[model samples]
Target chain A: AMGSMERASLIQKAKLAEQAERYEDMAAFMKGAVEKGEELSCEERNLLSVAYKNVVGGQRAAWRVLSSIEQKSNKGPEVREYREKVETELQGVCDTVLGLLDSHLIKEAGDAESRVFYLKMKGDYYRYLAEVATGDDKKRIIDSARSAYQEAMDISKKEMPPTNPIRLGLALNFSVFHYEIANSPEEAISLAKTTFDEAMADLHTLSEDSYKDSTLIMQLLRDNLTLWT
Target chain B: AMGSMERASLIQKAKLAEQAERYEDMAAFMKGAVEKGEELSCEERNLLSVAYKNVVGGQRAAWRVLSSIEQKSNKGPEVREYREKVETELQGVCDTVLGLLDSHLIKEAGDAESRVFYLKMKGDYYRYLAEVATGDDKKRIIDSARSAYQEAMDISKKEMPPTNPIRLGLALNFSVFHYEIANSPEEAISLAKTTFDEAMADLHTLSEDSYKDSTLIMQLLRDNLTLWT
Candidate 1:
């Protein structure tokens, strides 16, 4: 059994790793908490998601630069090999996090809010994978991302109020999925504007706790609308 | 005796830590090699400089935000404590790296190029400390940075050509010091323009090895001129 002290300590280490920008160490500590059977609170789930996002995010960025250089240069066997190596490592991390989310976090998500967060994270990692993937692999991963985002969007719309931060965040990310991965800026802008307007109408309903989170996403929604338009 | 393999392996590990964005671990690996009496190469010295730079860079950024929050907000005994705590840790890293450079690297800098690099790095870390320091401490650190930078500039001008990347880099950082720490934008602009114009005239003299490094700094110098003007 996981002692509360052990779980708390692991969480603390994870937070410290995040502060130090050591995302791999952050991911390991959060993974330890999960492995010890700590049912992550909503905050913990987001923290774990952030840890994996950053761990993979750096590799993804590296791959992009290397991939571009490999494409442009004649002398790029070296660049090609290293670029693919980075992709393989990046893919491994994505697979591990997605497996964790699917097998553990999503199944154990206790509330609609947590479920939406997990599914959005699932979509995010899949999108990350699709970034480097090719041929049918890219197509398949994109579909998976879309499906996950769609599920989260549907659940969030029905179960959570318009002013709920989770609902607003789901809309923000889901619209990003449409704009970026699907290349459907029209749909993304429409969805973002709809969400922005709906949240603006119910902004008064926002509680003190949700006010900051909700308003930030609301601003992002309007921001996206402006950019996309 | 430090085996070649041991030194090579330590450098390799340090490089890996940089790739993983684990600067603290990178610093440790470089320190291990130094403690084992390894005479670092020119590249290794730069690598160590980068490692120590990043290790303190994160803490410095965090201190800025927390310091601002403490200044503006009423709820900041907690913020003040943590802000000071970050500054203290940041100062320790700066001190350790500065000591290493002063005691070991500068003495054994081998040639003009390495000497310039080590001195510029000294200026850099002092500038980092100056960013977080206050009043007398800030003034002292800024002066140290200026002294190191001036020495590097003097040596680089005499020993290395205008097209030398190390020389160009020293000028870039020195101008940045003038602009940021010294708040003498006019002097920064003057120094940067002089360096940029000098390098441009001799641009064709640059070797392929230093071409990339030299040009990039030249671009940055001109960019700063444009911005500062």
Candidate 2:
């Protein structure tokens, strides 16, 4: 019993959701409208997919659907714009998974690299989402991101010693998140200093002559540690 | 018991509202919390005042309250920043009013210049507000802006001959509104053409060759008329 006019009315409500910044509702209403057979602008359709991806954490699924239509379209401005939008979205979505998104990279190093990267990305994704989210959604997203970062550090430790290059990189990034995202510069300083000391210990294990070989990188890390403290 | 704990909880919610884009809620919450003796940051206090300005349309009342605190504070960043914010908030709230903010200007017919300016501002305020407004709010704001433009044009006609400079000016501006705001380019074309002919007739009313010098402004209006057609 639904006609195209009904679809337009539904999409009108979808736009209202968009104006409110209620992303989940915006995506849902848009999806409903599209299913009911209304045509959408290229940008709007791209946004609809984003809404779906963000709300459902199902970017890979949404990308495939978008890819189908995208391939069918000619390379007019509409299709070109749509393709660029999809590509950007794909990178962001793919990141929420483990690693560099290739068969070889994902399977490397007992999957620890992929897992660590994915957890970091997940934490970062939700942190950015938290800044724009509201009410309970904001709380939920921030907690989830914190857990992701915490788990990433835990996993990294099992994979390698804390002062290993990869572990140190995660620690460095996590220190900033503690400062910026967690609102605890004190904790950031503590974490950074601990990492710096651990880095020195790890260098000693490589023989104290490590300073001559890695003076530049070590100095960079030391400078970063100083600023945090 | 609405003691310190009660106020603190309300302030917490106010901060939550601040985290969101729901401007009206942000102001109202802070207003409640601040009334309970909690101190806010200088920027936050100013924003709370603005929140009240937009939501209550009682900026005059707000400025008085803020003036007490504002006077006690040095004319440094806090006071300096607050003044610009108030000015900006004043324009946005004034748009929602039914009459000119100044009683003398609004009620006086010879006050067309003041009335016209206010109406134009109302249209602009509503235009920006509509882009961000949702559900019934968006519809209501757009309709109000349309009414403001229509009212301004009606008032202009009563003050001057149809092709008078002020009348022509309002028509030109509102023509763009009709196209951009009303979503009707065809309607814009007609208004422009109608104003063009009216302008031509007014020049005739003064008699031809009168430009030896009725002067540059009228000729400019004439050039604009041809561009519209």
Candidate 3:
């Protein structure tokens, strides 16, 4: 068995890095824990997800700025070279996180709740890849994202109530995909409207603990429906 | 003379807030120091500029997101109401910073360098206001931005060397205004190219302390030139 002390220290380091906005360091700390083959607790899993998500977010932002510069009517070859480098880094992070979720985290998910969380994260990374991919690669990434979201939605429906935060988050993000990547307002509206209505109906059933998170997701759904309709 | 210890602690608090990414708190701490009517040092002025700058940056980001949401095909009154609220907050921060610079900070700037810094900041805030303003307000903000930049440029050219960081920074941001808000690539190219060339010719004169900051701004000017041409 791996050293529990080392795993605990790594989790602490990850938390400290997050407080300081050091996402790269946070990602490295969490990745170290995963590589040690030790089982991660639910909180550790969330810490890992947030770490890589922010790291990838920085890369995406950098790539977008460079892409705009590279697309300008008159830019030297150096501009294009640097933009390509940023894209490579973005894609690498997205690929690494997706692989980790698919091969390690999802396989080890002990229950439906954790499985839904992993699947939603998979969809998120795939969607990030779709942002920069083109041609056949773009299509593949979009399809993969759709499949991940669909699986997460199915598990949430069967295992969790409509008012559950994870289920509501899953629905909110799925509708976002339909609205943004899929460019289908009707699908986005239908999914978001149904989720909002269902959540409102079950509002009284929500526990005190999950009440805040659940309602926040419900508001996002309502906002999207207001926009899409 | 007026509670030097209190002012010192305020500066320390502002620095800590910045490290923790608590820009709103940073702004409040800096504002308290300014309201005491004590003569501030250059470092204190810089800290104040950074605090308010970050606070306004957050408001601008929030307003942009809400504006996009509101522009979507359909939205309820609640959506527009919230967007307007964000816009009002954004405008308030911009106006507050601009007035602080214009009435108090700029008036007390004892040297050419500090004056240029304050004017550049004034231009920056006005440009921010121009982002959300409309009709006559937009026109007035744009004009004010240009005037402030021009004053900063005049002072920098006479009082500072081409390789000075403040001078280079003024040129970089002023050129940005021409390129972005004014939609005049020709003016941006002219300013950036001349400043970049002058800086390159005098690159050897740059002192070791200012070398890093000076070169970074020069690179930005050169990058803009590359994109604009």
Candidate 4:
């Protein structure tokens, strides 16, 4: 009965779930809409991952959304629209992520946000580089990407105060970068667990500016904790 | 009689002249002190030129102070102190002047002072480059340095609005660069003379903060004008 529910009602309920900071519920509800042939919009898929990203195991959950959208794009011609959409999104991701990387190299490292963002972008850029190359070069690229994610972990703890949700967001992204490269799932699980737990352990320090968004980010980290266990 | 003038009183009168923004009077008084056997201290020389640098041909006056010091240094070791002093002073001039040229290549041209200093330094950097290289390489470096001074002349007009006397300092430097290189003395003199004249013709635009010093620079320019004639 639930699987067969109308798409309108599912999105309405998903929004309510999001309002409640129940990302797990929100992502599942939207997934039901997809199963019911209401093909997921890019926004819906992103929101679903944003939901998956709210707690531990978010890497797994977000990956599922990205992968399924990818598969749907593979179903051919009519999915050409989806293919274009994916290409545009990836290109934007490539440009913006590396763009952050280039700027932070000069003079002084930028604000806490600038420092963390490029670190996060560094991991992603390497992944795209790895995707384009072959054999030894691909492996080299992936390793560099993996190192970037690891550095993100170090910065989140050492440089960026746990008082921010971006710290949480950056770690969740690192977990995904770790998982995608798959060279070290153990490293993935470790980062997902520690970076999230470290912040939750000191949640009282979260600044006024970050508290609201951080709670959602906390949800993403929580899913990762579940995924690893 | 001028050589026999009292050093102490001349310095006192020079200080008074400088206080009145009477750079012509101040410089003439200081030159009397120099003639009376007081080797100029770096501070004395710089201040005298700082007063000179206030407007037209200040670089010329400043260089005169520097040149005499450099000559006294050549009076030989134990004159070691004088030689060292001159070396330090010229090297400083070398570094800062060259420093200006280096900074401009990145984006926007610098302030009127930096543009002029680089053009002034350009001749020297080339002299060194030509000294080490023979024939074609020597020719190329010298030509490149020459072009930079010429560009400084162009930028002085285009970028540095002649509202300030630093424009005057640069033009004189351009003139000297021209004379030393001998390859473009005509272009050099034209710019040197015009940049100085244009500023002198519109002395009112010089900001109040700058006017006191500029009058000295103007006198320095007058000296260059006489020298060229």
Indicate which candidate wins on TM-score.
1
Candidate scoring better on TM-score of 2 and 3 = 3
Chain A TM-score vs. truth, each candidate: 0.91, 0.47, 0.91, 0.53
Task: Report the C-alpha lDDT of model 3 over A1-229, residue by residue, as the tens digit.
Answer: 2234366666765765565455776787788788777567779878988899888876777667666655673623444554565678788998888877766878988688889998998998898888888899789899999999999999999898898887888888888998898887789889999998888898887677778888888888888887777
Off by more than 4 A, model 4: A1-100, A103-108, A128-134, A207-209, B1-229
Write model 4 residue lDDT over B90-208, tens digit each, in one string.
Answer: 34443443443354421342455554544644654554344334477667877766787667667667766564555666666656656655566577667667766677777787677
- Across all models, the iRMS values in order are 6.9, 18.5, 16.7, 39.9
Show model 2 residue runs off by greater than 4 Å: A1-148, A157-173, A180-229, B1-150, B156-173, B178-229
On a 0 to 100 scale, what is the lDDT of residue B2 in model 4?
A: 41
Tens-place lDDT per residue, model 3, B23-47, is: 6757877877886777678788788
Docking class of 3: incorrect
Task: Provide the interface RMSD of candidate 3 in angstroms, 1 decimal place.
Answer: 16.7
Give the higher-lDDT candidate: 1 or 4: 1
Worst 10 residues of 3 chain B by lDDT: B73-82
Ranked by lDDT, top first: 1, 3, 4, 2
| Candidate 1 colliding pairs, count | 0
Error of 2 at A30 (Å): 13
Per-residue alpha-carbon lDDT of candidate 2 for residues A1-229, written as tens digits (9 for 90 to 100)? 2233355555554554444344555565655555553344544544554555464453334434444555665333433343344446555443333222122222332456556664665665666555434488667777877887888889887786544554566677677777776788888778777777776776755645544544444455677777766
Q: What is the TM-score ranking, best to worst?
A: 1, 3, 4, 2
Docking class of 1: incorrect
TM-score of each: 0.59, 0.30, 0.51, 0.30
Which stretches of candidate 3 lie above 4 Å from their native place?
A1-229, B1-5
